Amino acid sequence: AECSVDIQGNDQMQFNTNAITVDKSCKQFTVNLSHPGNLPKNVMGHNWVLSTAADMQGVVTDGMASGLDKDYLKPDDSRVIAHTKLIGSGEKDSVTFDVSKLKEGEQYMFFCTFPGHSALGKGTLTLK
Ligand SMILES: [Cu+2]
Ligand SMILES: [Cu+2]
């Protein structure tokens, strides 16, 4: 099966999908994020961050407090399973992670930690 997905964030706060499926036979998985908007990352930055559902709000809140220079992620945040850099217009970044970090039946969320963005810039990730 395919073990990658292409995700975009633009000059609005929604990703172009709200649900990612990771096939259970995949051993790694890659997310390729890009930003087809015109605004720079300090104004309309997006990252793609994966945590358990339970951990999402903490990661978002602590990430906002960490600021732009930390890509809006608390340093040494063990709650983050995988993530990309924060990108702006014209940029791109990919993350590959081990599917051994995921289990069937567990509830995962992906989201952007740029301030305010998680309200609309979030979705589920499911191993199946
Ligand atoms: Cu964002
Ligand atoms: Cu990191």
Experimental method: X-ray
Distance 33 CA to ligand 2 centre (A): 15
Distance 115 CA to ligand 1 centre (A): 8
Which residues have CB atoms below 5 A from the ion given as ligand 1? 46, 112, 114, 117, 121
Task: Return the HEC string of the chain.
Answer: CCCEEEEECCCCCCCCCCEEEECCCCCEEEEEEECCCCCCHHHHCECCEEEECCCHHHHHHHHHHHCHHHCCCCCCCCCCCEECCCECCCCEEEEEEEHHHCCCCCCEEEECCCCCHHHCCEEEEEEC
**Which residues lie closer than 8 Å to 117 by C-beta, 6 or more apart?**
13, 46, 111
Distance 24 CA to ligand 1 centre (A): 28
CATH 3.40.50.720 fits domain 1-128: no
Kind of pairing between the strands at 92-98 and 82-83: unpaired
Q: Do residues 18 and 126 make contact, with C-beta atoms less than 8 angstroms apart?
A: no
**Token representation of residue 85:** 């850099």
Q: Resolution limit in angstroms?
A: 1.5
Return the domain boundaries, the chain.
1-128
